[PDB]
Amino acid sequence: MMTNLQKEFFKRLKIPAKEITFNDLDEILLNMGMILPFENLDIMAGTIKNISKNNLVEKLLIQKRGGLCYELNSLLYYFLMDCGFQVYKVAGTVYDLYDNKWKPDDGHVIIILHHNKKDYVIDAGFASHLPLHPVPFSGEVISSQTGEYRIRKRTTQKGTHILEMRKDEWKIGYAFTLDPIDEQKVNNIQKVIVEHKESPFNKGAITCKLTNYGHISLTNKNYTETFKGTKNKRPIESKDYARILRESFGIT
Ligand SMILES: CC(C)(COP(=O)(O)OP(=O)(O)OC[C@H]1O[C@@H](n2cnc3c(N)ncnc32)[C@H](O)[C@@H]1OP(=O)(O)O)[C@@H](O)C(=O)NCCC(=O)NCCS
Numbered sequence: 001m002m003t004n005l006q007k008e009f010f011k012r013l014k015i016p017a018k019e020i021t022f023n024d025l026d027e028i029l030l031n032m033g034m035i036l037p038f039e040n041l042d043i044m045a046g047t048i049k050n051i052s053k054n055n056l057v058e059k060l061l062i063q064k065r066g067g068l069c070y071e072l073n074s075l076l077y078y079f080l081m082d083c084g085f086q087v088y089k090v091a092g093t094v095y096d097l098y099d100n101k102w103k104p105d106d107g108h109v110i111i112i113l114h115h116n117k118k119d120y121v122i123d124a125g126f127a128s129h130l131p132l133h134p135v136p137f138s139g140e141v142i143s144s145q146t147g148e149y150r151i152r153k154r155t156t157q158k159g160t161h162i163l164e165m166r167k168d169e170w171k172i173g174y175a176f177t178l179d180p181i182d183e184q185k186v187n188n189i190q191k192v193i194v195e196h197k198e199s200p201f202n203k204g205a206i207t208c209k210l211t212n213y214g215h216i217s218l219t220n221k222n223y224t225e226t227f228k229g230t231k232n233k234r235p236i237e238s239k240d241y242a243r244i245l246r247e248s249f250g251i252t
Contacts, residue, residue: 003082005053008061009075012036020083022115022134029124029132032076033210037066037249038127040201043194050187053078064250066209068201069125070109070189076124077111086114087122091189092176093158096200102158104196106189108174109181121151121163121176127208128215128226129165129173137161146210149173207249218244 002010002017010017013031020028042048042059049055056075059065066072073089080087091106111122113134120134132144135151142149149165156162159175181189193199208217214226223244224233236244245251 005057005061005078006082008057009079012061012064020080022085025113025122026133028076028079029122029130032072032124033130033132034212035209035250036060036072036124037207037209037251038068038072038125039066039205039207039249039251040068040193041065041205041207041251042067043202044205048190048194051183051190064252066207066249066251068193069123069127070186070193072125073109073111073123074183074186076122080111080113080122087111088180089182089186090176090178091181091185092163092174094174095172097171102175103200104192104198105158107193107196107199108176109186109189110174110176112178123163126173128210128217130210135163146215207245207251209249216248218248 007017013035015027015031051071051074056071056078060067060071060075077087077089089109090112092108092110093105094103094108096103109125113120113122119137122134123131128146130146131142131149132146133142135142135149137151139150139152147165147167149163151161151163153161156175159177162175163173164170165173193201195202205220206217208215213228217224220241221235222233223236
């Protein structure tokens with residue numbers, strides 16, 4: 001019936017095995033955001049394997065770990081393919097809002113879905129900026145607990161399209177193109193994130209996840225909680241780290 005990946009996927013995301021249709025994508029994205037932590041711990045620990053369906057199922061589903069955008073969306077890609085959707089992966093380049101500049105070229109991986117003559121961006125790897133719904137190329141606003149999002153076909157130094165977002169003023173989240181990327185490219189993207197001097201992900205541990213009242217983030221130095229409108233940062237010690245990872249993110 002269902003593939004091994006589908007079976008494991010349903011189990012991990014606590015979603016009853018069933019046929020997945022377009023209208024079911026919201027539920028998929030929601031659970032992923034609430035359960036699959038956004039993290040770079042393998043990069044920190046120096047235990048990085050190449051990306052593949054099997055490796056993704058082993059790490060994110062079976063060993064109940066999380067991952068970065070290229071892992072989260074690669075897994076979802078495989079899942080959606082098994083579910084029979086018309087999907088493909090494309091590279092993206094994120095914009096650094098604090099320092100006004102583009103992060104490394106193609107440091108993000110997203111999914112483009114074609115459904116009923118319409119294209120949508122499917123993204124479960126943007127950490128705390130998760131749309132939690134397919135974002136239509138037609139431009140209508142998509143709103144969720146994380147903020148508002150919209151797609152615009154605008155050429156930029158890094159692409160042909162952009163995903164903009166806001167809580168008040170619209171700003172570029174990331175730029176992208178519709179050029180299909182394969183596993184080798186995805187493995188190249190991983191390597192660049194592991195070694196680029198300006199890579200945001202090889203400078204310190206990060207683990208983030210959505211909650212019913214916001215989202216939570218944990219670094220080696222601080223635990224940041226966004227809760228019912230409030231945002232607190234608490235310095236932590238070595239032992240608080242291991243405990244929070246476990247208790248708040250299910251990572252053991
Ligand atoms: C990760 C993220 C949720 C952190 O923001 P937050 O939860 O609102 O809380 P803060 O902004 O105060 O940041 C908390 C910690 O995240 C760290 N951080 C932010 N972005 C980071 C990144 N890309 N890599 C590693 N650490 C990061 C900050 O340095 C901070 O550390 P500190 O508390 O020890 O000083 C937010 O930056 C985010 O959603 N980033 C998106 C990442 C992305 O582009 N993903 C797609 C490409 S893989």
